[PDB]
Amino acid sequence: MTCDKLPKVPVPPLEEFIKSNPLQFAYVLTDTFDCTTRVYVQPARLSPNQAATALDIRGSRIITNDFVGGPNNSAILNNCTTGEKATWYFQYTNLNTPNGSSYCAYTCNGEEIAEYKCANNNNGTDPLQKQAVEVAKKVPNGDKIHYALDNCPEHHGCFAFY
Amino acid sequence: DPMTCDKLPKVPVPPLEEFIKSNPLQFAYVLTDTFDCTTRVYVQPARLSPNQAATALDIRGSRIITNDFVGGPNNSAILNNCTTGEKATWYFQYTNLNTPNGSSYCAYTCNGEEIAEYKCANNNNGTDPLQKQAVEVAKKVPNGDKIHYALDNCPEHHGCFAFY
Amino acid sequence: MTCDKLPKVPVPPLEEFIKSNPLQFAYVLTDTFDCTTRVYVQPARLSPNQAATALDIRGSRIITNDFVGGPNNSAILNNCTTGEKATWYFQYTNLNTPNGSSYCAYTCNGEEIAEYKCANNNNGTDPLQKQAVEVAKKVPNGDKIHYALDNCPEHHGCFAFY
Amino acid sequence: PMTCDKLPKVPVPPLEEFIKSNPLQFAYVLTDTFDCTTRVYVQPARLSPNQAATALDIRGSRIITNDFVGGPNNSAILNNCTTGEKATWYFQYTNLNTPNGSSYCAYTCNGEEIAEYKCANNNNGTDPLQKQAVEVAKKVPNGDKIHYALDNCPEHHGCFAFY
Ligand SMILES: N#C[C@H](O)c1ccccc1
Ligand SMILES: N#C[C@H](O)c1ccccc1
Ligand SMILES: N#C[C@H](O)c1ccccc1
Ligand SMILES: N#C[C@H](O)c1ccccc1
Ligand SMILES: N#C[C@H](O)c1ccccc1
Ligand SMILES: N#C[C@H](O)c1ccccc1
Ligand SMILES: N#C[C@H](O)c1ccccc1
Ligand SMILES: N#C[C@H](O)c1ccccc1
Numbered sequence: 001m002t003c004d005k006l007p008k009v010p011v012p013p014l015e016e017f018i019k020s021n022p023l024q025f026a027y028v029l030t031d032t033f034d035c036t037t038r039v040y041v042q043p044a045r046l047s048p049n050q051a052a053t054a055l056d057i058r059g060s061r062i063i064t065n066d067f068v069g070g071p072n073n074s075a076i077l078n079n080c081t082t083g084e085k086a087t088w089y090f091q092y093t094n095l096n097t098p099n100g101s102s103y104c105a106y107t108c109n110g111e112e113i114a115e116y117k118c119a120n121n122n123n124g125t126d127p128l129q130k131q132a133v134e135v136a137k138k139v140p141n142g143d144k145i146h147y148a149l150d151n152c153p154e155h156h157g158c159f160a161f162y
Numbered sequence: 163d164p165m166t167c168d169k170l171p172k173v174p175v176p177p178l179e180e181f182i183k184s185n186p187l188q189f190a191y192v193l194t195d196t197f198d199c200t201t202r203v204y205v206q207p208a209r210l211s212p213n214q215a216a217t218a219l220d221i222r223g224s225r226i227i228t229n230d231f232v233g234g235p236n237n238s239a240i241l242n243n244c245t246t247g248e249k250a251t252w253y254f255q256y257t258n259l260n261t262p263n264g265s266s267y268c269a270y271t272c273n274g275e276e277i278a279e280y281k282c283a284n285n286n287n288g289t290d291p292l293q294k295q296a297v298e299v300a301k302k303v304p305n306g307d308k309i310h311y312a313l314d315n316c317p318e319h320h321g322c323f324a325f326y
Numbered sequence: 327m328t329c330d331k332l333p334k335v336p337v338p339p340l341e342e343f344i345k346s347n348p349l350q351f352a353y354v355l356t357d358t359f360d361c362t363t364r365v366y367v368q369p370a371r372l373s374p375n376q377a378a379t380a381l382d383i384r385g386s387r388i389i390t391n392d393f394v395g396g397p398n399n400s401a402i403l404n405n406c407t408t409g410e411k412a413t414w415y416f417q418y419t420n421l422n423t424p425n426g427s428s429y430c431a432y433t434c435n436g437e438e439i440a441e442y443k444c445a446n447n448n449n450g451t452d453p454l455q456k457q458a459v460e461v462a463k464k465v466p467n468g469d470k471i472h473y474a475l476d477n478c479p480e481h482h483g484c485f486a487f488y
Numbered sequence: 489p490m491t492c493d494k495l496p497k498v499p500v501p502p503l504e505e506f507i508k509s510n511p512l513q514f515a516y517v518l519t520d521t522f523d524c525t526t527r528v529y530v531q532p533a534r535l536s537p538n539q540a541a542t543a544l545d546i547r548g549s550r551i552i553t554n555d556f557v558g559g560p561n562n563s564a565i566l567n568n569c570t571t572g573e574k575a576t577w578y579f580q581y582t583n584l585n586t587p588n589g590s591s592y593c594a595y596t597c598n599g600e601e602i603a604e605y606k607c608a609n610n611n612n613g614t615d616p617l618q619k620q621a622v623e624v625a626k627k628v629p630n631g632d633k634i635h636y637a638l639d640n641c642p643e644h645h646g647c648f649a650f651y
Contacts, residue, residue: 021205039205041186045264045285047323055203060245062226064325080322081224100209121209158244159211161228163479165386165570166550275550304387304549307358348530365530367511371589371610373648386570388551390650406647407549426534447534482572485536487553
């Protein structure tokens with residue numbers, strides 16, 4: 001199983017992602033997205049390109065990425081700070097079930113997995129996440145994939161932010 | 163024209179949904195320099211949130227301030243700084259969400275008779291006439307002289323419309 | 327004619343300002359000092375630095391700055407709420423004439439005028455005020471200088487305050 | 489027993505005596521409004537037809553203003569510049585511009601109880617007259633509300649008399 005051979009389910013409508021807000025990454029690859037909250041934003045009223053934006057929030061820090069649909073069930077991300085581009089795919093999505101939402105996404109380095117993000121708002125109770133993670137772990141560099149929520153800063157009265 | 167911060171208008175908090183449909187907004191006028199060059203995103207409570215508090219995100223480049231909020235009496239929103247634990251009682255001077263010309267509002271929090279903070283948000287490049295008259299009224303209360311235009315000389319973007 | 331090259335008359339003795347109290351600004355640059363009454367205050371008895379204070383009063387709002395002499399006939403202001411400093415000069419003073427008092431003061435942003443206050447207590451009848459305003463308007467940013475006393479709030483029995 | 493209508497009514501000193509005292513702070517007041525407050529007196533405007541002086545009551549960034557003219561029985565009649573509301577005030581005592589500075593205590597009455605009380609000084613409350621005046625006014629009806637007005641005041645930013 002090489003990264004480029006992973007499932008690429010269709011991107012849900014943006015409204016499905018927004019109804020899921022907010023989410024937390026239960027499993028990631030690199031340490032960048034440990035202890036992170038995901039929020040999805042519609043495009044600004046006056047945005048000429050009408051791109052949506054993904055917010056990755058870690059305490060007082062935030063990574064932002066505009067995204068648009070691309071070929072082969074892909075999302076193409078534009079890093080708003082650096083202009084860096086990346087092609088992402090969904091291994092699966094399971095948004096807005098009666099037990100909440102989960103998904104797992106990935107970007108590839110040819111055959112290696114460059115980054116992995118599994119999000120949920122049900123504390124990892126979705127059976128699809130278990131299965132997806134085990135499958136992702138056996139991809140080249142999938143050894144790095146880890147539970148992302150172990151040693152996270154203490155909160156000060158907010159549920160989803162610190 | 164109301165004289166002190168305690169006497170400003172307090173319109174009903176619109177349903178969260180009206181705010182979320184306005185996402186994202188920018189702050190055209192603020193009181194302290196904390197909220198210059200800032201984009202606001204409203205977020206619904208997490209599914210498993212015990213208190214069902216919504217969250218206001220104040221995003222300035224690569225930095226974020228977060229505040230959970232819930233309804234309070236007299237059309238108040240009570241905020242909880244997610245990083246500090248610090249509480250603040252806010253009100254809306256006016257809201258004008260989701261018009262054919264977009265959304266604007268102005269919100270504030272008082273230190274008694276003075277204004278401690280002020281946030282005028284819009285997604286229509288400051289063209290709502292309500293916003294202009296709101297800013298003029300707020301400036302006249304104690305400490306209101308610090309309220310200023312918040313979007314001069316902000317950093318350059320890298321491909322994104324609403325973030326940098 | 328740029329702001330850094332405007333006239334800089336000697337700051338009169340404090341007593342001359344206090345004998346003028348209260349004044350109103352006839353012409354100002356920003357909107358801040360519209361519909362505003364100026365009162366000058368002597369240092370407190372126990373003040374170590376013996377700085378005098380300028381009070382800018384607009385309804386129930388007050389802006390306060392201690393000030394002291396600086397070089398080149400400057401007044402250095404200390405905003406009492408922030409500790410921010412600003413360097414002011416007098417374009418002219420004409421205090422305590424038989425037709426009352428007037429002056430025009432200004433603070434620069436290099437070659438631009440950042441703020442302008444022309445005060446009087448004679449309903450703007452000092453011919454010096456008209457010439458001074460005409461000169462300052464020609465300076466960069468000075469196109470914003472405007473008459474400050476149109477459509478001010480109505481009073482409830484007091485002459486100088488509302 | 490001492491009631492408000494029966495307190496001392498010393499003559500109002502000339503305005504210049506108050507202006508020479510500027511600025512003052514209130515060490516004792518009745519209502520909450522006049523805590524952490526600086527008092528500044530202003531002469532009438534040149535063009536003011538009635539020539540009423542003005543008292544300024546400044547608390548941080550907020551100012552209350554009252555024109556005043558002398559009335560009967562050593563009274564000052566105050567005109568709130570924002571409401572147009574009138575109040576008759578008196579001085580329990582004045583001690584302006586001694587070699588130890590200035591102090592006074594003034595009051596206004598709701599019949600036999602005291603509606604407001606303002607004890608000003610520019611000497612950190614060291615005038616012996618001031619202690620005595622306060623003890624007396626506290627025993628008047630409602631005078632139990634009179635308190636020290638300078639306990640937990642906001643921190644300053646380089647000015648001495650304003651914050
Ligand atoms: N999670 C995650 C990815 O970075 C992602 C994928 C699609 C759209 C936005 C963001
Ligand atoms: N899992 C789960 C919660 O609903 C949750 C917790 C933190 C951030 C987003 C969502
Ligand atoms: N802080 C701030 C915002 O403008 C705000 C956020 C939620 C409710 C009221 C006001
Ligand atoms: N005004 C306005 C725009 O719609 C706007 C611009 C930047 C960020 C949010 C919103
Ligand atoms: N008018 C005016 C200025 O703010 C100013 C100038 C000199 C001294 C005090 C205040
Ligand atoms: N000009 C003039 C008057 O004397 C005046 C009017 C209002 C405030 C200060 C002074
Ligand atoms: N202190 C005090 C009162 O407010 C007052 C009394 C007489 C004159 C001016 C002001
Ligand atoms: N008493 C005393 C102080 O020195 C003081 C402080 C502020 C204003 C006037 C006077």
